[PDB]
Amino acid sequence: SGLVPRGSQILCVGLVVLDVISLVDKYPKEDSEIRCLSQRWQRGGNASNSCTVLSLLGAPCAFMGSMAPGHVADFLVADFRRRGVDVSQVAWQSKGDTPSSCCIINNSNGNRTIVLHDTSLPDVSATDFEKVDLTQFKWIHIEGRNASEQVKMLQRIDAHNTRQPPEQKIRVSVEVEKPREELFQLFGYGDVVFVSKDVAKHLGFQSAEEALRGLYGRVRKGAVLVCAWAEEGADALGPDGKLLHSDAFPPPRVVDTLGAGDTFNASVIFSLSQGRSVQEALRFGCQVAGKKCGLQGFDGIV
């Protein structure tokens, strides 16, 4: 690790997982031995994907998440470095496995069957976050996971900001992506709150407009709540009460939407960290995520 200039990096806190994806002619019957058509090992995880996009956008970025020493972590660290991501804040654990998932894709109907990673590896704790020198960062994005610990991380960032002039305050964003009640306390933290379409629909909202008007009462004073809604584009709502919208920028052909939400989040964060307005950041998020949907992976998103 070398010298990182003060207030230069965007940190994403969350999951990194090894996804082993196998394409098969037909779903294997239990207890059978089959050969796949093709296989690929990929680095996944919401915060992990957002770091890849931030590096491709030209932002110095860092990932913070748990990993256990071993060959799975070696593959993931080499893949983070292949995408220019700084991994010096990784919380190395002495117990548990580095997450790894198995995804079987049936080439005859596109069905995806997933065997998700085990929960043995401890999540990043508030005590792990206390050890991080914050001066390095201009923005910290947190993927909502172990909410009670992440609330203490957010309170530490808020305390840091009270002693800084407006120019050296660290901007904060949070993502509430899973419909887990424990995560809903995270709406009250951060300057920017991203809420997924899946969370909005599980809370009874049928559109991004409904979700933002119905959930704005939960954010802290001054915060911007953002909700992307696939082909329907994305909306944002700030303290002035004006609903902002951008239409989607769909590709000529949709080929891969995995990580489109992480691409949208990273692109909104990047645009706002560059001093752009919320309307401009919302449009930029739709532009980059729409372009990504027409490409396999993140190469060529620009």
Cite the annotated binding site for ATP by residue number: 112, 230-233, 259-262
The amino acid that residue 211 corresponds to is: A
User: Which residues would be at the binding site for ligand A1ICK (CB under 6 A)?
Assistant: 31, 110-111, 196-197, 228-231, 233-234, 248-251, 254, 257, 260-261, 264, 286, 289-290, 293
Which of its own copies, ligand A1ICK, none sits in contact with 30, Cβ below 5 to 8 A by type?
A: its own copies
Tell me whether residue 76 or residue 258 sits nearer to ligand A1ICK (CB atom): 258
Which of 90, 84, 89 lies closest to 55 in space, CA to CA? Answer: 84
**Coil vs helix vs strand at 224:** strand
DSSP state, 65? Answer: -
**Smallest distance, its own copies to C-beta of residue 29, A:** 8
Which of 187, 254, 249 lies closest to 221 in space, CA to CA? Answer: 187
Half-sphere exposure of 267 (CA within 13 A, CB side): 25
Tell me whether residue 78 or residue 254 sits nearer to ligand A1ICK (CB atom): 254
Tell me whether residue 8 or residue 38 sits nearer to its own copies (CB atom): 38
Q: Edge-to-edge strand order for the sheet containing 100-106?
A: 38-44, 17-24, 100-106
End-to-end CA distance of the chain: 27
Name 262's bridge partners: none
Which of ligand A1ICK, its own copies, none sits in contact with 104, Cβ below 5 to 8 A by type?
A: its own copies
DSSP state, 42? Answer: E
CB-nearest residue to ligand A1ICK: 250
Which of its own copies, ligand A1ICK, none sits in contact with 44, Cβ below 5 to 8 A by type?
A: none
Q: Which stretch binds its own copies (CB under 8 A): 27-35, 151-159, 185-193, 263-271?
A: 27-35
Site for its own copies in 66-125 (CB under 8 A): 71-72, 74-75, 97, 100, 102, 104, 106, 111-120
Buried b (16+ CB within 10 A) or exposed e, 57-87: bebbbbbbbbbbeeebbebbbebbeebebbb
Which of 49, 37, 12, 82 lies closest to 261 in space, CA to CA? Answer: 49
Residue ranges binding its own copies (CB under 8 A): 20, 22, 24, 27-41, 71-72, 74-75, 97, 100, 102, 104, 106, 111-120
